[PDB]
Amino acid sequence: VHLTPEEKSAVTALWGKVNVDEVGGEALGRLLVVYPWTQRFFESFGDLSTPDAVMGNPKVKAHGKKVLGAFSDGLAHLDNLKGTFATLSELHCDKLHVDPENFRLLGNVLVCVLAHHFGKEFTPPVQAAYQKVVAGVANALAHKYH
Amino acid sequence: VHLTPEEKSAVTALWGKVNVDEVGGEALGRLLVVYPWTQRFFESFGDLSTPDAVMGNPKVKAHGKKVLGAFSDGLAHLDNLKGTFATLSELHCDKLHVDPENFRLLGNVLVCVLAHHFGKEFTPPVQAAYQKVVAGVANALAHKYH
Amino acid sequence: VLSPADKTNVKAAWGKVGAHAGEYGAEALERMFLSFPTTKTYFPHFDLSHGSAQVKGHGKKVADALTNAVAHVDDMPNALSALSDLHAHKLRVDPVNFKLLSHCLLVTLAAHLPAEFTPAVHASLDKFLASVSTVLTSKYR
Amino acid sequence: VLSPADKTNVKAAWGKVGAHAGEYGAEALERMFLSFPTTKTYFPHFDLSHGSAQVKGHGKKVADALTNAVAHVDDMPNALSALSDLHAHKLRVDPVNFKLLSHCLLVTLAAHLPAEFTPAVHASLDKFLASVSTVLTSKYR
Ligand code: HEM
Ligand code: HEM
Ligand code: HNI
Ligand code: HNI
């Protein structure tokens, strides 16, 4: 995972327009709707019984803010994603017991959410840059598993 | 990748007992039998029409041995698999057009072949070390794709 | 398996795609080649650059196969039988790549259909694309 | 699909395994936990210590389900229906992990079946384990 200078610029340009709170809730919600087995990690969040129950669930939305906040922070450190995500990797393994395949699923759902929000502005080259990012973030979050 | 000192030693010790003619022919042959669509890359090898034909095919056997030769180079330079396999990665992308997902298939067939030969000697810890090795080789061979 | 709601959702979304099916198929392929360069190994004989007549023509074929699958949504193994034969015996694309193209088709649809690409519809489309992919890889061995 | 030759191969190989099935199930789990540590994320409630009785007990459950699947190789969806329900609604293991366990089962079989693990039998066992996995993930969404 190495972005070109122009890809880095494109990622940063698009991200400046993202409502990171809103987008996080939407990405996590869509994960739980599209891949409903991922709800296994969120029993404490309450009603996840229908697509609307999931998407509008305030605990899902609040959690999505955390997730996308950490992602947003990682965009500032694209050359050291493994370091950036090391303590979160350890946490997701040791405390949360989250299969890292879930990070890959969430990254692609996030890409779909970005496409949905930005429409034509989410061009194929912009997507390609974001795919490098989400692959790097997922690989980083997986890296300290043991 | 991340072989511990003790896993590096275990990998080296087992490899010192490997018969490359047998293991190489068996691993490439089984790739072509178990995942027969991979035969698409080896039409020039002649007769691949039955499992016996594949396993006994002189070109399959010779090529399997060559492949293991490159594997041996990797095992001799575990801290720089990416550098070790750079030229071969370029070849597999630019000239051979081989989808790197196939490298994972070969890695796991190789593990099965080691288990088949060594039996109980191929212990769960030894297997775990070899899984790191084959993952590392596949990832290094994939690295120069573009 | 596709539920009654899945089939309603897929028919509505792909119906809205309408005349754009070929355009969106080609766009999905482009997004795939740029995002996942290993997928290009299957097209050494193609110009894969933007505006490619080969990519446009192939996108149309892919989209038309999906339209046929939607038309025969309750009989996909048979409606796609000849295509699945071609995949198993000639094209021989590793199954992982179907997931990459499916994802790129979802991204394309998301980028074009703001109102229609709801979470429920997204879920149904992903299931539909996975079902098509399963049929197309079903005869490999 | 599993061919008659596949079914013959699987029945013969699993027959040879016989009463060792439970032991081999445990060994495959141990191999998986060591080789693919992410799979342990599904067992944080287990004792995973060396020679764990809890892991051995689980190995027996996995093996017995496989024995049943072999016995019912012509209709695995029905034979495994209760188990597939449990996987879809409770266990919810990501589908990627089924390939990891399947590979570890092949390794275990290879290590114990020097005569039986021919290339053809290896191929049939791989198809069989993938088919079992497909059934177990069939109701996920
Ligand atoms: C971009 C990828 C992800 C990032 C950056 C991320 C980040 C975070 C952060 C910052 C926290 C708070 C840590 C704390 O409580 O100390 C968290 C918690 C958590 N995450 Fe992740 N996460 C990601 C993906 C996922 C995925 C895909 C899942 C599972 C489907 C997951 C499951 C959880 C769970 C279960 C918690 C604790 C929730 C609770 O407090 O009840 N994460 N994550
Ligand atoms: C992952 C471990 C692998 C290693 C270490 C490896 C290594 C090699 C080596 C050393 C050569 C000879 C290069 C030369 O001509 O100078 C070669 C050639 C080749 N490899 Fe790979 N290989 C691997 C996997 C694969 C896989 C999985 C496939 C396809 C499924 C593949 C397809 C080919 C083909 C088609 C050739 C050329 C054969 C010919 O001469 O017709 N390789 N490989
Ligand atoms: C990354 C590779 C790749 C994937 C994932 C893939 C996924 C799919 C999917 C899945 C949703 C569909 C419906 C589909 C449909 C088609 N493919 Ni795909 N194909 C792929 C690579 C090909 C290749 C290669 C060809 C041949 C193109 C050519 O013109 O040579 C092809 C040809 C076809 C054709 C033309 C067949 C004919 O000549 O009769 C159709 C239709 N397909 N392909
Ligand atoms: C990596 C995770 C994982 C995989 C891939 C997997 C793959 C499989 C396969 C595939 C060949 C089979 C036949 C199988 C069969 C079983 N598993 Ni699996 N299981 C897995 C994780 C579990 C877990 C976790 C449980 C619950 C165990 C417990 O005791 O809490 C489980 C429970 C079972 C049970 C017990 C069900 C019951 O309580 O009635 C059987 C039988 N299975 N599992």
Q: Which chain B residues are within 8 Å of C92, Cβ to Cβ?
A: 37-38, 40
The residue whose CA has the least distance to atom 6 of ligand 1 is: A67
- The residue type found at A100 is P
Which of D3, D20, D32, D34 is the best residue to mutate to test the B interface, defined by the most B CB atoms within 10 Å of its own CB? D34
Ligand 1 centroid distance, CA of A99 (Å): 11
Give the tokens for residue C89: 């015996």
The method recorded for this entry reads X-ray
| Residue recorded with tokens 């019912």 | D72
10 Å CB burial of residue D7 (0-12, 13-18, 19+) is: middle
Answer whether D89's CB lies under 8 Å from D123's CB.
Answer: no
- Contact: D111, B111; criterion CB under 8 Å: no
Please report, for residues C109, C130, C139, D128, the alpha-carbon distance to residue D98 in angstroms, rounded to integers and kept in the order given: 30, 17, 20, 12
**Separation in Å, CA of A17 to nearest CA in chain D:** 33
Chain C contacts in chain A segment 112-131 (CB below 8 A): 112-113, 115-116, 118-120, 122, 124-125, 127-128, 131
Number of structural domains found in chain B: 1
| Residue recorded with tokens 């991922």 | A38
**Separation in Å, CA of B107 to nearest CA in chain D:** 11
Q: Which chain A residues are within 8 Å of C123, Cβ to Cβ?
A: 33-34, 51
Q: How far is residue B47's CA from residue B53's CA, in Å, rounded to a whole number?
A: 6
Angle at D65 between CA D125 and CA D128, to 5 degrees: 20
D141 to chain C, any CB pair closer than 8 A? The answer is yes
Q: How far is residue B56's CA from residue B77's CA, in Å, rounded to a whole number?
A: 32
- The residue type found at C45 is H
Q: How far is residue B48's CA from residue D88's CA, in Å, rounded to a whole number?
A: 40
Q: How far is residue B123's CA from residue D31's CA, in Å, rounded to a whole number?
A: 8
Longest CA–CA span in chain D (Å) reads 41
Answer whether D114's CB lies under 8 Å from B116's CB.
Answer: yes
The reply to whether A116 sits in an annotated binding site is: no
Q: Which chains touch C (3 or more CB pairs under 8 A)?
A: A, B, D
Q: DSSP string covering A74-124, please?
A: HTT-TT-HHHHTHHHHHHHHHTT---THHHHHHHHHHHHHHHHHHGGGS-H
Question: Nearest by CB to C127, which of D1, D127, D141?
Answer: D141
Q: DSSP string covering B41-102, please?
A: GGGGG---SSHHHHHH-HHHHHHHHHHHHHHHHHHT-GGGHHHHTHHHHHIIIIIT---THH
Q: Which chain A residues are within 8 Å of D93, Cβ to Cβ?
A: 37, 99
Look up the domain containing B102 and give its range: 1-146
Longest CA–CA span in chain C (Å) reads 41
**Separation in Å, CA of A42 to nearest CA in chain D:** 13
| Residue recorded with tokens 């109102």 | C115
Q: How far is residue B96's CA from residue B62's CA, in Å, rounded to a whole number?
A: 18
DSSP state, residue C89 = I
- State the sign of the Cα–Cα–Cα–Cα dihedral B58, B59, B60, B65: positive
Closest of D7, D16, D4 to residue D116, by C-alpha: D16
Could you tell me which CATH number the domain at C1-141 has? 1.10.490.10
- Provide the terminal-to-terminal Cα distance of chain D, rounded to the nearest Å: 22
3-state secondary structure of A16: coil
Q: How far is residue A130's CA from residue A26's CA, in Å, rounded to a whole number?
A: 17
Answer whether D101's CB lies under 8 Å from D32's CB.
Answer: yes
Give the tokens for residue B72: 């041996």
- Contact: C94, B145; criterion CB under 8 Å: no
Longest CA–CA span in chain B (Å) reads 44
Answer whether A127's CB lies under 8 Å from C107's CB.
Answer: yes
